[PDB]
Amino acid sequence: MDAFQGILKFFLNQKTVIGYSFMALLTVGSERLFSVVAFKCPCSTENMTYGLVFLFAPAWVLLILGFFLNNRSWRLFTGCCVNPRKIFPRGHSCRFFYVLGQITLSSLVAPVMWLSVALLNGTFYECAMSGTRSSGLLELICKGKPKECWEELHKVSCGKTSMLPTVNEELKLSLQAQSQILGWCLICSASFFSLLTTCYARCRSKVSYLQLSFWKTYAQKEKEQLENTFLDYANKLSERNLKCFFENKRPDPFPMPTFAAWEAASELHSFHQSQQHYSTLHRVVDNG
Amino acid sequence: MDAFQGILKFFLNQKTVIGYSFMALLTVGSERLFSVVAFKCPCSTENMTYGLVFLFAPAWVLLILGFFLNNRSWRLFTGCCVNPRKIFPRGHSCRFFYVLGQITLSSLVAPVMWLSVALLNGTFYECAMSGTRSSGLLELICKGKPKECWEELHKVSCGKTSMLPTVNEELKLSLQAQSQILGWCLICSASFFSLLTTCYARCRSKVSYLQLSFWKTYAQKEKEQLENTFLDYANKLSERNLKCFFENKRPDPFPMPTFAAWEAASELHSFHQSQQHYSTLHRVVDNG
Amino acid sequence: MDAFQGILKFFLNQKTVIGYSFMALLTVGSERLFSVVAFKCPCSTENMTYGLVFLFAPAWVLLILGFFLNNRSWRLFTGCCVNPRKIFPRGHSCRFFYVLGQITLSSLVAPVMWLSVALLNGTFYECAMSGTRSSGLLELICKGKPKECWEELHKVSCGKTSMLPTVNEELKLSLQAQSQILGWCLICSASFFSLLTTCYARCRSKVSYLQLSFWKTYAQKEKEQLENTFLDYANKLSERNLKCFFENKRPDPFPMPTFAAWEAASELHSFHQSQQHYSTLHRVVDNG
Amino acid sequence: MDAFQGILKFFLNQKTVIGYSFMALLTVGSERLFSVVAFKCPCSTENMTYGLVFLFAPAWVLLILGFFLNNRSWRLFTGCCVNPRKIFPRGHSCRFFYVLGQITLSSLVAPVMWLSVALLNGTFYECAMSGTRSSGLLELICKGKPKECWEELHKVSCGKTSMLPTVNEELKLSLQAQSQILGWCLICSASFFSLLTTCYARCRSKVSYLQLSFWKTYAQKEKEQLENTFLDYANKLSERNLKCFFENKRPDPFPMPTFAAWEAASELHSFHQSQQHYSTLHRVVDNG
């Protein structure tokens, strides 16, 4: 009765680590569906373009999908060209780049998680590195191999190469291991950069830990109370407009906030410790 | 009791991304039914027409089906020839093309999702590119092949070609990889164009984010309250007409809105920030 | 309790697209039962008649079945020869052809859906095109074939033809692909004609979108209220007639509408915007 | 609770098309039991009689079974020889043939549905057409066959014929396809005749669509109210007769309708628009 409610406190408080763990399980299961069912490397001069598109084109699609599902990217830009100075204010002219950096860094998580699982399953790199045709990086792969390594390297994936197939089986192990080292150098350097920018944003905060915990509680249910006020004032307005249409009556006046009050409550909020307001709707009510 | 109600808030708020994800799962499962069960490429001079019809004719059918299921295409055109100046108003003469651009762009989503899954499963392009018979684009496919590649290329799908079947197996890999590169160039450029026009429509909006959130709440249940008023005034009218038919009585008068009020409430709505009305039914009640 | 009621709103509002999707699933499953279990092509001079009857005779039966199940075809014709001028009125003498065009076009949907699934499964066309015996259209099928293609083409379905069975297997692929191109040319041109006549009927309507939505709500439950009035006046009439038969009594009079009022309420309804009546029963009550 | 009641309206309104679809499913499943388990063609001079009895004798039995289960054939004939002029009235002397045509045409549906499924499964026609022994119709089957087709055709079903069994396998395909063409010519011409006589009976009706819908509602529950009056007056009569037998009492009189009133209420009903009566029991109560 209340024991199951006691463990739903544990699955709602740690909700930012279940969401990032369900994103990793979807990225792993989607890469194994592309490499098994759809990917089959040719053995042509189009090896470089074919393997480098299966690596970077699903990363470009996941980046654009992060801009659609980000709710604070639409709060920033909706109605921008009416007056752009409400997004570029006079006191804090560089807060627009701080907010825009947060949308960009938050939507760069699922692209990086794609590039790491695709490099730890080294089939896309093996196809792309075969057709390299470069002066450097070709002596490193073919070091103690016969002389037909510099011409027929791009056929090592499909088989069907006349250079003694115990040599072909160890050229597919030297390329499958170069990709898995790059897959760990990307996980290790993106985890360190992610902690270094989160720790810098908290160390440079204007409030301490206890006031920031109240600020997050207020902003969470200013959103819930705003959905119930919109849903209450729109039932009273639609009931008024329908009775005066069918009965041909003149309506009683309906008081709504003006246009200057709607646009002032939609600005960008920056904290000031002299007068502590926790939203921009809190600020226009207290100041008038 | 209320825990399952708490997660139906999560499956009703994100309803525009479950609908677009269920459309992609139906398009993938329908392309695998056509390519496995029905598609079998001939090896004739009709290769070009056969493969290019299985690509573009299910895209033409899905485009017409998007015009039928679009509710705002019927609100725009019903009763057009009575007076066309209610669709071409005097102040905003170019809003008719802005609305018509929204029906066209919204119904172009399922055609593009068909053309991408059909190109990532490269059977329709392999049949169509075989019978090309062009001066260009035929030297690119047959580069280091024997001289019977320029005459018997259209038989490479069915087998039964006398050009050493290790050469036929790598002409089917060079065409199956050219189609999968075009399948990713279409997903990447349609995702970028879809974000560029949505961001331009929000940046050029007349209202800010908070007033647009109230406008969407009002328009959603002006539709629910209109279905309950129509259902209430049609029960009272059918009860009146049936008692005066069987009993041979003369009826009491039933007040309804006139024809000039029905047609004025069906016009096209454009926001004005001087007098803020949230529908065209709100405007004819307040103005008279 | 009310959550399942909330999704039955979604399965009752979109009821005209579940009915047309269940008709397509029955037509596909019925064509696979005829082509697998019953159809087996002979190899005689009766190839043309045998395959062209399995194509067009189930389309003729589905057209006649659409006239039986159309409720508005019986409302138009019942009691026609009593006075034909109630179906050919004086003001609108061409509305009879507009209504008769709607019964004909609505019952032509299941014949066209039969002819498309039968042509996309190319067994009926392969049997019928084999026995063509025409000067044209026989050189197009036999282009680079031996000279026994002009005489023994009608045996290519059954096998047992002495023209090198790798040639017989590619004459069955050139005919199975000509039928699937015609199956897509019929789906594409019937979808475009279906949208062009629906859009012309809405653009030429006498009322706008909002008045047409009330008109459909009234006509739906004038039918429900008429079934409850007939069921109420027939219980009171059968109770009266049975008590005066067994007890040998004389009955009290039972007031019913006259014959001139029954026939005037059964005419064909055309909207007029000067006096807006939503049925022909609404018109004879208000006018007398 | 009421949702399942809402769909039983759909399975009771369309009750005349579920009954005709369950008759077709029983006729198909009964023909496959006769042709698989019981039918085995001899190869004698009795081929013509054996196959033509399995075709027409189950059609004769299904026709007689339609006269037993027709309730309006017993209402017409019961008590005929008491006075035949109540079935041959003076004003409408040709209504007796119109009613008798309705019993005959309604009971001719299951015979025609037997003859069509038996001809679409061409085993009964193949046995019967083999032993034809006619001057015509024997040159059409044996056109380009050896000379032992005119003498040993009746053995082609059982096998065991010395005319090169690739010729016997294509004489069994030319007869199995002649029967399936006749099976579609019977379905197509009986569907067209069934619509042509129903449309002529409705176009020549005395009442319009709305008065005919009330007439069908009254006749349906004059039958239900008559079963409850018979069941109520027979409980009161059997209680009276049993108390006066065991107690040796004299009974109180029980008023019943006379013999002239029982026979007048059992006549044949024809509508008159001058005095509109909806049954013959309605007419003898109002007229006396």
PDB file of C-alpha atoms in Angstrom, chain A residues 5 8 34 38-44 46 49-50 53-54 56-58 60-61 64 67-69 71 74-82 86 158 160 226-227 229-235 237-242 244-247 249-251 256-259 262-263 265-266 281, chain B residues 3 9 13-14 17 120 166-167 169-170 173-178 180-181 184-185 187-189 191-192 194-195 198-199 202-214 217-218 221-222 225-226 229-230 233 255-257 261-262 265 271 273 276 278-279 281-282 284-286 288:
ATOM      1  CA  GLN A   5       5.052   4.124  -2.745  1.00  0.00           C
ATOM      2  CA  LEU A   8       8.745   5.066  -6.184  1.00  0.00           C
ATOM      3  CA  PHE A  34      22.548  -1.590 -38.732  1.00  0.00           C
ATOM      4  CA  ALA A  38      22.010  -3.483 -43.509  1.00  0.00           C
ATOM      5  CA  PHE A  39      25.786  -2.952 -43.585  1.00  0.00           C
ATOM      6  CA  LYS A  40      27.777  -4.945 -46.124  1.00  0.00           C
ATOM      7  CA  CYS A  41      31.040  -3.403 -47.261  1.00  0.00           C
ATOM      8  CA  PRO A  42      31.863  -3.279 -50.979  1.00  0.00           C
ATOM      9  CA  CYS A  43      35.400  -3.819 -52.165  1.00  0.00           C
ATOM     10  CA  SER A  44      35.661  -0.908 -54.559  1.00  0.00           C
ATOM     11  CA  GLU A  46      33.946   3.743 -52.768  1.00  0.00           C
ATOM     12  CA  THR A  49      32.610   7.220 -48.557  1.00  0.00           C
ATOM     13  CA  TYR A  50      30.476   4.199 -47.659  1.00  0.00           C
ATOM     14  CA  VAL A  53      28.530   7.859 -43.967  1.00  0.00           C
ATOM     15  CA  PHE A  54      27.286   5.039 -41.713  1.00  0.00           C
ATOM     16  CA  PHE A  56      28.494  10.307 -39.166  1.00  0.00           C
ATOM     17  CA  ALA A  57      25.038  10.483 -40.749  1.00  0.00           C
ATOM     18  CA  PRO A  58      23.163   8.834 -37.823  1.00  0.00           C
ATOM     19  CA  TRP A  60      23.819  14.242 -37.568  1.00  0.00           C
ATOM     20  CA  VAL A  61      20.213  13.030 -37.330  1.00  0.00           C
ATOM     21  CA  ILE A  64      18.832  17.665 -34.962  1.00  0.00           C
ATOM     22  CA  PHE A  67      16.894  20.486 -30.889  1.00  0.00           C
ATOM     23  CA  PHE A  68      13.263  19.489 -31.495  1.00  0.00           C
ATOM     24  CA  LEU A  69      12.739  17.864 -28.093  1.00  0.00           C
ATOM     25  CA  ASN A  71      11.695  22.694 -24.514  1.00  0.00           C
ATOM     26  CA  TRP A  74      11.452  27.089 -28.085  1.00  0.00           C
ATOM     27  CA  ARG A  75      11.019  29.339 -25.049  1.00  0.00           C
ATOM     28  CA  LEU A  76      14.065  31.315 -26.180  1.00  0.00           C
ATOM     29  CA  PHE A  77      13.196  31.858 -29.842  1.00  0.00           C
ATOM     30  CA  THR A  78       9.386  32.094 -30.110  1.00  0.00           C
ATOM     31  CA  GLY A  79       8.463  35.638 -31.061  1.00  0.00           C
ATOM     32  CA  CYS A  80      12.073  36.753 -31.485  1.00  0.00           C
ATOM     33  CA  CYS A  81      11.610  39.157 -34.409  1.00  0.00           C
ATOM     34  CA  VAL A  82       8.917  41.206 -32.631  1.00  0.00           C
ATOM     35  CA  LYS A  86      14.268  41.000 -24.999  1.00  0.00           C
ATOM     36  CA  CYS A 158      35.073  -9.244 -48.613  1.00  0.00           C
ATOM     37  CA  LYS A 160      38.845 -12.892 -52.291  1.00  0.00           C
ATOM     38  CA  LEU A 226       0.282  27.538 -14.888  1.00  0.00           C
ATOM     39  CA  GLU A 227      -1.248  24.575 -16.718  1.00  0.00           C
ATOM     40  CA  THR A 229      -4.781  28.361 -14.674  1.00  0.00           C
ATOM     41  CA  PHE A 230      -4.688  28.223 -18.479  1.00  0.00           C
ATOM     42  CA  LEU A 231      -7.106  25.289 -18.437  1.00  0.00           C
ATOM     43  CA  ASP A 232      -9.452  27.195 -16.109  1.00  0.00           C
ATOM     44  CA  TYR A 233      -9.518  30.526 -17.958  1.00  0.00           C
ATOM     45  CA  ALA A 234     -10.033  28.803 -21.311  1.00  0.00           C
ATOM     46  CA  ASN A 235     -13.112  26.927 -20.114  1.00  0.00           C
ATOM     47  CA  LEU A 237     -13.845  31.964 -22.237  1.00  0.00           C
ATOM     48  CA  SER A 238     -15.205  29.241 -24.518  1.00  0.00           C
ATOM     49  CA  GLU A 239     -18.432  29.033 -22.498  1.00  0.00           C
ATOM     50  CA  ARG A 240     -18.888  32.789 -22.868  1.00  0.00           C
ATOM     51  CA  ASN A 241     -18.299  32.878 -26.623  1.00  0.00           C
ATOM     52  CA  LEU A 242     -20.700  30.042 -27.427  1.00  0.00           C
ATOM     53  CA  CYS A 244     -23.443  34.763 -27.156  1.00  0.00           C
ATOM     54  CA  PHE A 245     -23.290  33.212 -30.633  1.00  0.00           C
ATOM     55  CA  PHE A 246     -26.338  30.941 -30.568  1.00  0.00           C
ATOM     56  CA  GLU A 247     -28.557  33.257 -28.517  1.00  0.00           C
ATOM     57  CA  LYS A 249     -26.529  38.228 -27.100  1.00  0.00           C
ATOM     58  CA  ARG A 250     -24.002  40.898 -26.270  1.00  0.00           C
ATOM     59  CA  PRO A 251     -21.268  39.596 -23.955  1.00  0.00           C
ATOM     60  CA  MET A 256      -7.284  39.385 -19.629  1.00  0.00           C
ATOM     61  CA  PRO A 257      -3.694  40.623 -19.268  1.00  0.00           C
ATOM     62  CA  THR A 258      -2.607  43.150 -21.867  1.00  0.00           C
ATOM     63  CA  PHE A 259      -0.080  42.571 -24.628  1.00  0.00           C
ATOM     64  CA  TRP A 262       2.262  38.992 -21.817  1.00  0.00           C
ATOM     65  CA  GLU A 263       5.567  39.949 -23.442  1.00  0.00           C
ATOM     66  CA  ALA A 265       6.560  37.866 -18.494  1.00  0.00           C
ATOM     67  CA  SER A 266       8.280  35.933 -21.316  1.00  0.00           C
ATOM     68  CA  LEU A 281       6.858  36.089 -13.563  1.00  0.00           C
TER      69      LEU A 281
ATOM     70  CA  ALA B   3       0.170   6.171 -10.253  1.00  0.00           C
ATOM     71  CA  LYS B   9       0.452  12.451 -18.448  1.00  0.00           C
ATOM     72  CA  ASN B  13       2.120  15.264 -23.521  1.00  0.00           C
ATOM     73  CA  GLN B  14       4.605  13.576 -25.883  1.00  0.00           C
ATOM     74  CA  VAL B  17       6.589  11.980 -31.209  1.00  0.00           C
ATOM     75  CA  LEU B 120      18.282   1.872 -47.573  1.00  0.00           C
ATOM     76  CA  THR B 166      32.771 -13.539 -58.949  1.00  0.00           C
ATOM     77  CA  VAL B 167      32.411 -10.432 -61.135  1.00  0.00           C
ATOM     78  CA  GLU B 169      28.666 -10.758 -57.174  1.00  0.00           C
ATOM     79  CA  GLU B 170      30.678  -7.533 -56.924  1.00  0.00           C
ATOM     80  CA  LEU B 173      27.610  -4.851 -54.163  1.00  0.00           C
ATOM     81  CA  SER B 174      28.592  -1.681 -56.006  1.00  0.00           C
ATOM     82  CA  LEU B 175      24.954  -0.864 -56.813  1.00  0.00           C
ATOM     83  CA  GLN B 176      23.561  -1.841 -53.409  1.00  0.00           C
ATOM     84  CA  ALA B 177      26.017   0.610 -51.818  1.00  0.00           C
ATOM     85  CA  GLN B 178      25.267   3.517 -54.155  1.00  0.00           C
ATOM     86  CA  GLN B 180      22.381   3.353 -49.349  1.00  0.00           C
ATOM     87  CA  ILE B 181      24.474   6.511 -49.702  1.00  0.00           C
ATOM     88  CA  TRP B 184      21.348   8.807 -46.024  1.00  0.00           C
ATOM     89  CA  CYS B 185      21.652  11.978 -48.108  1.00  0.00           C
ATOM     90  CA  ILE B 187      17.403  11.615 -44.394  1.00  0.00           C
ATOM     91  CA  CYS B 188      20.085  14.188 -43.580  1.00  0.00           C
ATOM     92  CA  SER B 189      18.824  16.942 -45.883  1.00  0.00           C
ATOM     93  CA  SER B 191      15.854  16.640 -41.289  1.00  0.00           C
ATOM     94  CA  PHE B 192      17.761  19.899 -41.747  1.00  0.00           C
ATOM     95  CA  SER B 194      12.373  20.442 -41.418  1.00  0.00           C
ATOM     96  CA  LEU B 195      14.122  22.257 -38.569  1.00  0.00           C
ATOM     97  CA  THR B 198       9.861  25.279 -38.057  1.00  0.00           C
ATOM     98  CA  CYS B 199      12.418  27.627 -36.481  1.00  0.00           C
ATOM     99  CA  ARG B 202       8.395  30.410 -34.507  1.00  0.00           C
ATOM    100  CA  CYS B 203      10.935  33.242 -34.768  1.00  0.00           C
ATOM    101  CA  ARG B 204       8.458  35.228 -36.883  1.00  0.00           C
ATOM    102  CA  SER B 205       5.454  34.619 -34.621  1.00  0.00           C
ATOM    103  CA  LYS B 206       3.331  37.516 -33.395  1.00  0.00           C
ATOM    104  CA  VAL B 207       3.108  36.313 -29.782  1.00  0.00           C
ATOM    105  CA  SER B 208       5.720  35.126 -27.309  1.00  0.00           C
ATOM    106  CA  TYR B 209       5.957  31.670 -25.756  1.00  0.00           C
ATOM    107  CA  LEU B 210       3.516  32.172 -22.886  1.00  0.00           C
ATOM    108  CA  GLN B 211       0.675  33.670 -24.925  1.00  0.00           C
ATOM    109  CA  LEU B 212       1.087  30.944 -27.550  1.00  0.00           C
ATOM    110  CA  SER B 213       0.644  28.323 -24.830  1.00  0.00           C
ATOM    111  CA  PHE B 214      -2.697  29.835 -23.815  1.00  0.00           C
ATOM    112  CA  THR B 217      -5.199  25.549 -24.800  1.00  0.00           C
ATOM    113  CA  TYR B 218      -8.164  27.678 -25.870  1.00  0.00           C
ATOM    114  CA  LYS B 221     -11.397  23.023 -25.999  1.00  0.00           C
ATOM    115  CA  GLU B 222     -13.271  25.465 -28.106  1.00  0.00           C
ATOM    116  CA  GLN B 225     -17.339  22.747 -26.227  1.00  0.00           C
ATOM    117  CA  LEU B 226     -18.579  23.157 -29.801  1.00  0.00           C
ATOM    118  CA  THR B 229     -23.384  22.582 -28.088  1.00  0.00           C
ATOM    119  CA  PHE B 230     -24.128  21.064 -31.501  1.00  0.00           C
ATOM    120  CA  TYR B 233     -29.207  21.978 -29.994  1.00  0.00           C
ATOM    121  CA  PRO B 255     -34.033  30.614 -32.657  1.00  0.00           C
ATOM    122  CA  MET B 256     -30.904  29.816 -34.679  1.00  0.00           C
ATOM    123  CA  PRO B 257     -28.062  32.031 -35.930  1.00  0.00           C
ATOM    124  CA  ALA B 261     -23.481  34.847 -38.808  1.00  0.00           C
ATOM    125  CA  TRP B 262     -22.691  31.261 -39.829  1.00  0.00           C
ATOM    126  CA  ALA B 265     -17.642  32.680 -38.019  1.00  0.00           C
ATOM    127  CA  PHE B 271      -3.765  37.425 -34.918  1.00  0.00           C
ATOM    128  CA  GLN B 273      -1.869  42.403 -31.091  1.00  0.00           C
ATOM    129  CA  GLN B 276      -6.161  40.141 -29.059  1.00  0.00           C
ATOM    130  CA  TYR B 278      -7.868  33.881 -30.012  1.00  0.00           C
ATOM    131  CA  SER B 279     -10.288  32.622 -32.682  1.00  0.00           C
ATOM    132  CA  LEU B 281     -15.570  33.030 -33.208  1.00  0.00           C
ATOM    133  CA  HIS B 282     -14.074  35.147 -30.420  1.00  0.00           C
ATOM    134  CA  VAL B 284     -17.358  38.088 -34.183  1.00  0.00           C
ATOM    135  CA  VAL B 285     -18.770  37.949 -30.640  1.00  0.00           C
ATOM    136  CA  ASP B 286     -16.660  40.821 -29.294  1.00  0.00           C
ATOM    137  CA  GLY B 288     -20.660  42.189 -33.370  1.00  0.00           C
TER     138      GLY B 288
END
